């Protein structure tokens, strides 16, 4: 008997998987325990509409980090820093990179999860990477003066 599963059951696998089973089970365990539902032409329909709606906004969300990959992976933000000899007085941080990328080239990042480790104290050419899920490396130029 065909039920739509409401959570992974360990042999009778994960959510939405249509599994067939002795009615007794269905009626007196799964169903009253809200841990599944019987697969009607009615409910099979919402399930399709449920898988569509998911993989819609899912591969919609992959339309950002595909779009921010094809912009930030060429454009370079250049950072002014009070100079020193191959050492910075302040520190350019995630926060800074964020802002600079905004005022300059007109883009917006979080800046959560870029490189949080050790806000960068030197000058040079760095490649930092952005996120979530397949994603983009960025070029950032820390230079001189103000």
């Amino acid at each position: 008997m065909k039920v739509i599963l409401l959570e992974p059951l360990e042999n009778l696998g994960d959510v939405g998987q249509v599994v067939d089973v002795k009615p007794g089970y269905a009626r007196n365990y799964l169903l009253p325990r809200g841990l599944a539902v019987l697969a009607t032409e009615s409910n099979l329909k919402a399930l399709e509409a449920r898988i569509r709606a998911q993989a819609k906004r899912l591969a919609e969300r992959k339309a950002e980090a595909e779009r921010l990959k094809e912009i930030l992976e060429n454009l370079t933000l250049t950072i002014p820093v009070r100079a020193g000899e191959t050492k910075i007085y302040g520190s350019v941080t995630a926060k800074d990179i964020a802002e600079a990328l905004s005022r300059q080239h007109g883009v917006t990042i979080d800046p959560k999860r870029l490189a949080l480790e050790k806000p960068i104290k030197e000058l040079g050419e760095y490649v930092l990477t952005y996120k979530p899920h397949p994603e983009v490396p960025i070029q950032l130029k820390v230079s001189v003066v103000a």
Binding site: P23, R27, L38, N43
Partner: protein, 97 residues
């Protein structure tokens, strides 16, 4: 009232027919009736006890139609009442217009 609340099935009278001898088609001289008498045949009737809105509704049905109790539960719109409840969930919902 031993009758299925969904299907409508109720007890029928039937004859119970006692036969002797060998089928004509086994080369017997043919079957013979030593008796015929009325019996009845009940529906195979069960409790389906189910939870709908607040409440716990109990249908008495032929084991045959047991599925339709659950079909009727998949019909859910707006009842905060007491048992009855199925008075609603019933033939109003089985047929209506």
């Amino acid at each position: 009232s031993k009758v299925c609340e969904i299907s409508g099935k109720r007890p029928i009278v039937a004859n119970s027919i006692q036969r002797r001898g060998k089928a004509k088609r086994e080369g017997g001289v043919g079957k013979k009736t030593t008796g015929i008498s009325k019996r009845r045949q009940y529906p195979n009737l069960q409790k389906v006890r189910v939870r709908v809105a607040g409440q716990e509704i109990t249908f008495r049905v032929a084991a045959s139609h047991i599925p339709k109790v659950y079909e009727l539960v998949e019909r859910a719109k707006g009842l905060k009442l007491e048992g009855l409840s199925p008075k609603e969930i019933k033939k109003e919902l089985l047929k209506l217009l």
